[PDB]
Amino acid sequence: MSYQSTIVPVELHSFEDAQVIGGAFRDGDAVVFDMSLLSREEARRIVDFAAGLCFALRGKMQKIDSVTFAVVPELSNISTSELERAA
Amino acid sequence: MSYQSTIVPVELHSFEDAQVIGGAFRDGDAVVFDMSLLSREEARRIVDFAAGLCFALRGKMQKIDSVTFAVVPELSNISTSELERAA
Ligand SMILES: [Zn+2]
Ligand SMILES: [Zn+2]
Ligand SMILES: [Zn+2]
Ligand SMILES: [Zn+2]
Ligand SMILES: [Zn+2]
Ligand SMILES: [Zn+2]
């Protein structure tokens, strides 16, 4: 999309995958992350890291479904349907 | 200090503290936080949120002692002694 930004759909495997969300989101991309392969404890760690990542850059965090969340950059205008489609 | 930065010392009581650490760090302040009064689960949540803040803004997370951590902004030159003094 315009201004070097896209939606990165990723599948998480463990807490080290916090860096995958981090790398893309810090570079101005929205990230839609699937936590289906994580334990509830691992998923809580990812969501807390993602909340930190989002707060630092004035982004928005949203829950797509039971296992999928998204981090959206500050000046981005991405609807839930677009994040849902990317998921 | 220069460019709207300081050291903010905080005794933490809950995960509600994440937005307080976040609010100050995102503006370029170093934050030194004592987690002695948190459960082990709450302390892990704070550290995961703080790792997300650090990643987003290229900051440094430093363990001061068993219960005290600090988040230092990217271009800040704060020693361990200064963070220890503020704690
Ligand atoms: Zn494009
Ligand atoms: Zn991995
Ligand atoms: Zn000052
Ligand atoms: Zn300041
Ligand atoms: Zn408190
Ligand atoms: Zn309590």
Numbering used by the authors:
A (entry chain A), B (entry chain B): 63 to 149
Question: What does the published report state?
Answer:
At the cell division site, FtsZ protofilaments form a highly dynamic, membrane-bound structure, the Z-ring, which serves as a scaffold for the recruitment of the extra-cytoplasmic cell wall biosynthetic machinery. Here we investigate the physiological function of Corynebacterium glutamicum SepF, the only cell division-associated protein from Actinobacteria known to interact with the conserved C-terminal tail of FtsZ. Our structural data revealed the FtsZ-binding pocket, defining the SepF homodimer as the functional unit, and suggesting a reversible β-sheet-mediated oligomerization interface possibly regulated via an alpha helical switch. We found that FtsZ filaments and lipid membranes have opposing effects on SepF polymerization, pointing to a complex dynamic role of the protein at the division site, involving FtsZ bundling, Z-ring tethering and membrane reshaping activities that are needed for proper Z-ring assembly and function.
Helix α3 formation and stabilization were not due to FtsZ binding, because the crystal structure of unliganded SepFΔML revealed the same overall structure than FtsZCTD-bound SepFΔML (rmsd of 0.83 Å for 160 equivalent Cα atoms in the homodimer), indicating that peptide binding produced no significant conformational changes. The presence of this helix has important functional implications as it caps the β-sheet that was previously described as the dimerization interface of B. subtilis SepF11. This interface, which was also seen in SepF-like proteins from Pyrococcus furiosus and Archaeoglobus fulgidus, is precluded in the C. glutamicum SepF structure by the presence of the C-terminal helix α3.
